[PDB]
Amino acid sequence: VDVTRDIVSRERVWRTRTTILQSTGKNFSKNIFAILQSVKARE
Amino acid sequence: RDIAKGHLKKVTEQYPDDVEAWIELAQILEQTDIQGALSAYGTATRILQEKVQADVPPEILNNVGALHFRLGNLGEAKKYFLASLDRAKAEAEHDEHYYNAISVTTSYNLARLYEAMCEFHEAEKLYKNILREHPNYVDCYLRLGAMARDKGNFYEASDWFKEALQINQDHPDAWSLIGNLHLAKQEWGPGQKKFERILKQPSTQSDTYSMLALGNVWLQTLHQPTRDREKEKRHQDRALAIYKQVLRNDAKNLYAANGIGAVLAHKGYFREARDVFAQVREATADISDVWLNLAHIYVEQKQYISAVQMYENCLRKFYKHQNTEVVLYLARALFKCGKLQECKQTLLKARHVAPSDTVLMFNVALVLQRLATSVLKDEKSNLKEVLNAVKELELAHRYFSYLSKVGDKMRFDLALAATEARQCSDLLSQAQYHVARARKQDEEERELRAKQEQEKELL
Amino acid sequence: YGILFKQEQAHDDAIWSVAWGTNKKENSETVVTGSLDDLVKVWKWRDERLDLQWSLEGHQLGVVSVDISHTLPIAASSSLDAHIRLWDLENGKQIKSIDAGPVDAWTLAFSPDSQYLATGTHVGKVNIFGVESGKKEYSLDTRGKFILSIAYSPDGKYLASGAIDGIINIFDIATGKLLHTLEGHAMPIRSLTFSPDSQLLVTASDDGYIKIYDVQHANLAGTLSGHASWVLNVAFCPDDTHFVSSSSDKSVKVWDVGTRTCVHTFFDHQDQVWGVKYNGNGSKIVSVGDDQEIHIYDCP
Amino acid sequence: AGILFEDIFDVKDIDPEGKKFDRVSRLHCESESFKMDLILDVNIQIYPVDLGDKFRLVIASTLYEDGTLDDGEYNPTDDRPSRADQFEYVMYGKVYRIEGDETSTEAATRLSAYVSYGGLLMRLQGDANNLHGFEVDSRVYLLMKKLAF
Amino acid sequence: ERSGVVCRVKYCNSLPDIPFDPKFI
């Protein structure tokens, strides 16, 4: 029906699964993978 | 959007008969702070009334009620959605703008509110009113099964979820909810991978939610004594590879580092777990996982305060204010008087909602024996205490008898209770000793008070 | 609707149970409380004031339930200690101590005749002890998981039991046999009571739906979205016009038993409400919770 | 180590009394995992904060990450691992009072550790177990840092 | 005592549900 394309085309959904899993902070992986590699190097 | 913001800051100061400027303001600010969008729709509502007597279109009262629905103004958002419905109903000639779709979205948000307004029945009825008029809608069909899922994972919740998938198999949300079905009963540990690898096709791929659900179902296989069989180590390394992958594609994926720190903690790298969980905490400490993992790192210092603080913070929610697992995590280093005697209280509070568990009935007995031997070994204790300790020891012995007949255990046979029974018998002998000590101290205090009373008679 | 009375620090520990006599008889001229601090405070409620009348002790573990004889100012009290103890509310002495043996006993259920006393157990049966006897007279052989709740009808015609499987086991106290089994729930039934007329049977479930089945034909009379949190306790007034339900979220709702509409929601509990009970007339409603305190809502 | 106390905080008021000074504002802040309370004066001129600003506050006994005690003299010219290197606002001050709800018989449940950072005052108030690291007339460093969240 | 308390201490982390966002238009 057109009711589907009537709504999915105007809707303005702002949040979804991935936006919950993502940090909104500035913690990228430069400060994470660093220790991840260092502890492997200790092994 | 930055250019849209900087243009809107130019239209906001000057007043060239601004009419839709606040609409475009709120249309960006609904991702940013929700109050800015609210202020913009608030002023846009009145700015649409000075030129003519024209009613507010339903789309604005709808968007503002949708803003307020995220807030605690649930009743106010409800009035907004009611007014949007009444207004969209009045749009008998807006067939181009499709007033009907506007009423559809408004009713959807309204049933979502009633679902959220502790009124599941109104949400049910509104969702059915969308089904009866438009069975090609998904979320109305899904939230309905969500409501029934509260009562149980086996009602028409599960059916409506599967039926939704059959109509729209390429709907990642319905599919994810499918895999969420199997998470109730974890007996589908290894077999969930097939159902999880369905939509892992390249057209879907980079679905971080599936990848993480995979790493989670893979992590559940950890905490096994088969690590020396080179079986859990490979599982750890595999999940670590998953996490590294979802890290390279999403450095901000806090659940990636969450599981990385989990496997490091299972590695005993609790300091490496500590600071990765700390970075998670800094980014978003609100999630139920950090309140646990962080407390489990702090408690591992044997000294702790934050652990019980974080256990308290996670229990603040109404979800499971009465909870057994939190007390099982907390029942640790139980030897301080405020840990021993208090943990009895929290074990009893847990058991009064879950009396059927063996582990509560076992740990309450272990803490009882810990206290009883903390006063029936050497202590020149208070007199009433040695009367009470033998009572507690008797009840511990009764539990020791009752536990031994139960078949199923905490995946660990309780055959080792014989040493608890021996401790019980020798604590009983110590009770029969310390009650003699009790009477000697009794006569001591009586002669002390008498020799004081005589001094008072002298005065 | 409002709060008439409140006490601060009415107990030193969570009030797990409260009972108020509902007859015209003197048994209504007192309040019995059971809390985790092992203080069975008998309050008088004289002068429309919650005086403390007796302070009974001796329970090893905290009081899981208190129930007042429908015929006398006497109550029975139970604990996880499985020593069910009985008291006279106008002398404050101990009558007896029904030792269950192994430490598996649960909430109590005073018969309206005040002659039998049902108890729950991890075996799933409902052991009907005798008030003046203490011996296990007869036990309903309806095994399963755990009898989390049990209740006597004001006239004594039926008897229900809340399992951990959401299996209402409608017993018959007049013959001792399982007649119906209402399985409209899958959540652990926390508590239930009988209508003043023994016609409606409310079921308090962790799913938050206070569904209200029927007993005479064993059918659902309608759904009721009661709380988002677990429904912990639910009592009827005596005139049979409304019923309150206790949540796990500090609310108390005055649901209309006829319209299934909340006519008032109380919010003067600082922690979650273990129990609620009416007066002899149904105006004063006592409520108690983890906040160790007692609140008397007035519903004229 | 020398890390006396740490928590997540957020600013919940500034200058409730009105702005008594121009480069210094009272911050009234709350902790989040311990729900302790803080009244801190910051140099609001070089380190501005607003209501709702979230920050890490690590009150430490010494700056050095090896925990070696400083002599309390300002020196610069130093390589040594220093906690300051990973903060934004660091102050040095003298704990000058520790009030609490001591009774005559049983101990305080809550303490209020008062610190003067060369005259910029701080009161940290909460359950005593988090304040056990404070003793009156002891040197401490504030080491706070705003969480971008 | 001869032992500490028995505990299946496991570093768990769940996943969030679908947010079912209100349909702004």
Q: Which positions in chain B touch E8 (Cβ < 8 Å)? A: 223, 328, 410-411
DSSP character at residue C225: B
The helix (H) or strand (E) run that includes residue C18 is strand C15-20
Q: With beta carbons less than 8 A apart as the criterion, state whether B41 and B26 touch.
A: yes
Chains B and D touch (3+ CB pairs under 8 A): yes
Is A26 near chain D, with CB under 8 Å?
Answer: yes
Examine chains B and C and say if they touch (3+ CB pairs below 8 A): yes
Chain B CB contacts of D32 under 8 Å are 285
Q: List CB contacts of C91: < 8 A, sequence separation 6 or more.
A: C54
Tell whether B313 lies on the interface with E, counting CB pairs under 8 A. no
User: Can you identify the CATH homologous superfamily of domain D5-148?
Assistant: Nucleic acid-binding proteins (2.40.50.140)
Any chain A CB within 8 A of the CB of B208? yes
Contact A13 E21 (CB under 8 A): yes
Cβ contact B281–D8 (<8 Å): yes
The runs of H, that is alpha helices, within chain C are none
Q: Do chains C and D touch (3 or more CB pairs under 8 A)?
A: no
B144 min Cα distance to partner chain D (Å): 35
Q: Is chain E touching chain C, with at least 3 CB–CB pairs below 8 Å?
A: no
Judge whether E15 is closer than 8 Å to chain B, CB to CB. Answer: yes
Q: How many domains does chain C have?
A: 1
d(CA B112, CA E24): 13
d(CA C215, CA C160): 9
Helix/strand/coil for B327: helix
Rounded-to-integer distance, Cα C223 and Cα B115, Å: 14
| D148 vs A contacts (CB less than 8 Å) | 25-26
Whole-number Å distance between alpha carbons of D9 and C27: 54
The angle formed by the CA atoms of residues C75, C78 and C79, to the nearest 5 degrees, is 150
> Nearest-CA distance from E4 to chain B in Å?
7
Chain A CB contacts of D149 under 8 Å are 24-25
Q: What's the N-to-C CA distance of chain D in angstroms?
A: 27
Largest CA distance in chain A: 61
Flag whether residue A3 sits within 8 Å of chain E, measured between CB atoms.
no
Domain boundaries, chain D: 5-148
Of E15, E16, E24, Cβ closest to residue A14: E24
Q: Give phi and psi for B349, each to the nearest 5.
A: -60, -40
**Partner A contacted by B168 (CB < 8 A):** no
The 3-class SS string of D44-107 reads CCCCCCCCCCEEEEEEECCCECCCCCCCCCCCCCCCCCEHHHHCCECCEEEEEEEEECCCCCCC
Task: Give Cα separations from B340 to B345, B364, B369 (angstroms).
Answer: 9, 10, 10
Q: How far E9 CA lies from chain A's nearest CA (Å)?
A: 23
Q: How far is it, in rounded angstroms, from Cα A11 to Cα D71?
A: 64
SS3 assignment, position B60: helix
**CA B60 to chain CA centroid, nearest Å:** 35
Query: Chain D residue closest to B314 (CA)?
Result: D33
* Yes or no, beta carbons of E13 and B293 under 8 Å apart: yes
Contact assessment for residue B8 and residue B29, using Cβ atoms and an 8 Å cutoff: no
| Nearest-CA distance B101 → chain A (Å) | 6
β pairing state of C136-140 and C126-130 = antiparallel
DSSP state, residue C233: E
Establish if C165 touches chain B: CB-CB under 8 angstroms.
no
Q: Which among E1, E8, E9 has the least Cβ separation from residue B370?
A: E1
User: Strand, coil or helix: what is C6?
Assistant: strand
For residue C270, give every residue at least 6 positions away whose Cβ sits within 8 Å of its Cβ, in sequence order, or none.
Answer: C250, C289, C291, C293
Query: What is the rounded CA–CA span in Å between residue C82 and residue D58?
Result: 50
Please tell me the distance in Å from A23's CA to the nearest CA on chain E. 13
Inter-residue contact B273 to B281 (CB < 8 Å):
no
Report which of B361, B417, E6 is spatially closest to residue C103, judged by C-alpha positions. Answer: B361
CB nearest A20 (choices: E16, E23, E25): E16
CATH number of the domain residue C87 falls in: 2.130.10.10
Cited resolution, angstroms: 3.0
Tell me the residue range of the domain where C167 lies: 1-300
Interface contact A11-E23, CB threshold 8 A: yes
